[PDB]
Design a protein around this ligand. Structure first.
Ligand SMILES: [Cl-]
Ligand SMILES: [Cl-]
Ligand SMILES: [Cl-]
Ligand SMILES: [Cl-]
Length: 130
């Protein structure tokens, strides 16, 4: 039940788990309240293209601030995610394999800060329900 996508931008990318990832370019840094279902990337500071793929064992990501490095498995357990939905859960990495974001669950230190960059990549994670 595994998958792997190169993530174009702009794009709306339906996923085998019933969710979609939407990408687009934006000039401005987001103002919305912090949440795990959106993400901001600075193209200049991360290796493109982005990919979205399912988990492998050993997968770890570096948390914001002094959070430290955290194994993805631990994140799924703490979130009480059913074993079947984790095997199917999108993981957003850069072209180098750095895990940037686990949509809906956790952000890495690699999320853009508001630093006067000319342009950002904006990501959104949303269900195909209603
Ligand atoms: Cl906004
Ligand atoms: Cl808001
Ligand atoms: Cl958090
Ligand atoms: Cl940044």
């Amino acid at each position: 039940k595994g998958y792997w996508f190169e993530l174009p931008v702009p794009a709306l990318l339906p996923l085998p788990n019933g969710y979609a990832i939407i990408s687009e370019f934006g000039e401005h840094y987001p103002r919305k309240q912090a949440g795990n279902d959106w993400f901001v990337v600075d193209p200049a500071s991360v290796s493109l293209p982005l990919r979205v793929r399912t988990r492998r064992r050993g997968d770890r990501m570096v948390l914001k601030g002094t959070g430290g490095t955290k194994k993805l498995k631990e994140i799924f357990i703490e979130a009480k995610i059913p074993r079947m939905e984790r095997d199917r859960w999108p993981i957003v990495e850069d072209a180098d394999g750095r895990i940037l974001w686990v949509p809906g669950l956790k952000k890495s230190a690699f999320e853009a800060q508001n630093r006067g960059q000319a342009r950002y990549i904006l990501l959104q994670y949303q269900a195909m329900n209603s």
